[PDB]
Amino acid sequence: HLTPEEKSAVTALWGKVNVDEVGGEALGRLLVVYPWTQRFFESFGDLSTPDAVMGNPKVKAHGKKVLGAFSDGLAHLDNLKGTFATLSELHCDKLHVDPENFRLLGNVLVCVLAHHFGKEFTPPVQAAYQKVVAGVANALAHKYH
Amino acid sequence: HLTPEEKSAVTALWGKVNVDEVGGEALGRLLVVYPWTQRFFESFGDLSTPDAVMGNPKVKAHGKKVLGAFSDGLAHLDNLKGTFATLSELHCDKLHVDPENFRLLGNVLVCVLAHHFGKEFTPPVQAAYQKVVAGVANALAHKYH
Amino acid sequence: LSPADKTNVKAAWGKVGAHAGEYGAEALERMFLSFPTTKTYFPHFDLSHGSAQVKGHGKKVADALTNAVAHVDDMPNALSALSDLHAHKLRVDPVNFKLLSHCLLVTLAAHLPAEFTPAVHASLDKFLASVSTVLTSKYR
Amino acid sequence: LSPADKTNVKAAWGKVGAHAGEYGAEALERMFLSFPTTKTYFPHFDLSHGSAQVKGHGKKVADALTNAVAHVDDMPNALSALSDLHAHKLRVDPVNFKLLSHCLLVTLAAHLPAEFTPAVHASLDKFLASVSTVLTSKYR
Ligand code: HEM
Ligand code: HEM
Ligand code: HEM
Ligand code: HEM
């Protein structure tokens, strides 16, 4: 349920996002801030320090994929469920990630946007992004519902 | 998504439930165990002790309504969303109850069923009831989604 | 935990008596069946009904909970090694302690007719929440 | 909180400097707009932008957080009165501390270009989670 002003807030900011970087930043911070999530990324090699996490090329590459799916949801705000269906099967039925972590990654992304855009990330812009990341998290959790 | 065996577990137990009592027991225990929920029930009068809560006639009466809605969901397991639509508007848009409390009340109901049925409330029967109360909580939270 | 809470948890502990390890195994089984995401922490277990591994693990869990109740005013110290294990080695998601705690309460409800009163339910919920707080205090 | 966490929270505190009360008010506004369920705890407030009441309240919240950081190894004692207030009088749902804490982190991110590194983010998250643990320790 985004209003047109909420939609404007979201798309005008997203146009400015570096899509090669921001997803790795959010995934890396998830792994640093919520370290239990490292359980799913054993194959990624050195996660021993925050610098090792943030500089790990597999974290950056994987985060690029993660952000690509966010971008696909931003383009389909009225059908997030179909947009996220195969990813919901993957994360829920195959990986068994607790869906609370979908909420945490969304909020980490919000922090990354706040850090990159500073004052431009106003309280109304944040509110619109909170609706988007909650909608993406609920769509990704559909197979638990 | 209940299987037929899950459906059998649920309906065979529910047939035995005292629908005049179990909802008041679960609502009273919610108010005792998670006392912040008393914030929504100021008009109910004496909630000062667990005995005062459990013996309060308004808690018993209100719990009877709450259980009536659970019973309606058990009869419509493939359309919980429409079943709970007006209650979702009420709880989300008018009352602003955090939907985590829908999960807590469902789990309190599970504890009440375990206490009343003892060994008959087997681990598989509990699992089936957990699917039902999660589905009811997600349906009631639809207007937040 | 208030004095009354300590009293209530002790009532429950004493009634459960020597069944505690059996009830721990039942609570684990309840969790695996009700919350199948928790199973992936036990890939090397057979989680089928009657599994010797679940029986053994439930005795360990029960022993840790009894240690926590026996040292209820010093639980951070009593559970320190287990807090390290769950966060650092096992990477248990904090959500999962809420799931096991609920299953431990349901197990007690299913075996404690007289004792699982609303007040004792509240006291056991607070005790398990306090144990969970310590066991999630060491992520780093 | 580890020694490094205390170091990092102190770095952030010192950079925020005398802006803390303004940033507290901004974090509250972020919470009310992003999580409108939290508004019902403030029915007698005007929550519009520029509200003197939100400005005043944000200074109170900031002062409490600075008290907690100044007494970081004794936070249960430092925040005891506020824990009583939030649980007993205000009946704040525990979920809501996660919402305010997130909004406090976003506010800091929006004002701390150099300091909001991944490590300092983690340290601030742990500090706010620890404050929240104390402020939800008194339900009864
Ligand atoms: C909530 C927002 C999330 C989005 C949008 C997202 C998106 C993705 C995408 C696009 C894929 C690549 C799938 C493929 O290669 O086709 C991926 C894979 C994966 N995701 Fe996520 N994800 C989210 C959250 C998480 C979280 C919170 C976790 C764990 C903590 C996780 C762990 C995994 C894993 C382990 C893989 C690899 C799967 C494999 O290759 O076998 N995801 N995710
Ligand atoms: C999750 C399962 C729940 C169900 C099925 C449920 C069901 C109901 C029903 C059937 C009604 C009566 C509505 C009418 O009279 O038409 C009611 C009202 C209400 N419910 Fe719930 N409820 C749930 C959870 C909660 C919780 C967790 C809270 C608060 C903690 C809450 C607080 C209220 C309030 C304050 C009313 C009165 C509304 C009014 O009369 O103005 N409900 N609920
Ligand atoms: C009431 C909370 C809990 C208690 C008291 C507890 C206690 C214990 C104890 C005593 C051990 C054995 C330690 C070894 O003997 O060093 C253990 C191991 C473990 N626990 Fe927990 N635990 C708790 C919650 C959880 C949760 C929520 C999970 C996951 C859903 C979990 C997963 C594990 C695993 C996977 C092991 C290692 C098992 C083995 O490989 O044999 N624990 N726990
Ligand atoms: C970082 C967590 C928090 C801190 C440090 C904090 C701090 C404070 C402080 C210092 C007061 C003023 C106490 C009076 O001066 O005695 C207060 C009051 C209050 N707080 Fe919090 N609080 C926190 C989280 C919350 C949350 C999450 C809510 C609700 C969503 C909330 C709701 C209230 C309310 C409604 C008041 C009373 C306001 C008044 O009527 O003027 N607080 N808080």
GROMACS .gro file of C-alpha atoms in nm, chain A residues 31-33 35-40 92 95-101 144, chain C residues 36-42 87 90-96 99 139-140:
model
   36
   31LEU     CA    1   2.658  -1.072   0.891
   32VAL     CA    2   2.849  -0.835   1.125
   33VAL     CA    3   2.551  -0.704   1.326
   35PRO     CA    4   2.629  -1.282   1.344
   36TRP     CA    5   2.409  -1.592   1.362
   37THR     CA    6   2.324  -1.523   0.999
   38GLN     CA    7   2.683  -1.635   0.912
   39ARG     CA    8   2.547  -1.988   0.963
   40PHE     CA    9   2.407  -1.973   0.606
   92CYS     CA   10   1.161  -2.109   0.343
   95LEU     CA   11   1.707  -2.307   0.336
   96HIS     CA   12   1.470  -2.279   0.636
   97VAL     CA   13   1.588  -1.922   0.717
   98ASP     CA   14   1.380  -1.782   0.999
   99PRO     CA   15   1.173  -1.502   0.842
  100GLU     CA   16   1.266  -1.265   1.127
  101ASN     CA   17   1.595  -1.235   0.943
  144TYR     CA   18   0.574  -2.010   0.589
  326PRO     CA   19   1.048  -2.740   1.140
  327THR     CA   20   1.301  -2.462   1.076
  328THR     CA   21   1.462  -2.559   1.410
  329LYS     CA   22   1.551  -2.903   1.275
  330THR     CA   23   1.837  -2.774   1.065
  331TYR     CA   24   2.044  -2.719   1.380
  332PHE     CA   25   2.041  -3.100   1.429
  377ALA     CA   26   2.600  -1.803   2.003
  380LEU     CA   27   2.599  -2.313   1.704
  381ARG     CA   28   2.484  -1.972   1.580
  382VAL     CA   29   2.137  -2.022   1.715
  383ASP     CA   30   1.905  -1.754   1.594
  384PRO     CA   31   1.755  -1.570   1.896
  385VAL     CA   32   1.399  -1.638   1.767
  386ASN     CA   33   1.452  -2.004   1.826
  389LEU     CA   34   1.016  -2.148   2.016
  429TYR     CA   35   2.674  -1.291   1.991
  430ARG     CA   36   2.979  -1.099   1.877
   0.00000   0.00000   0.00000
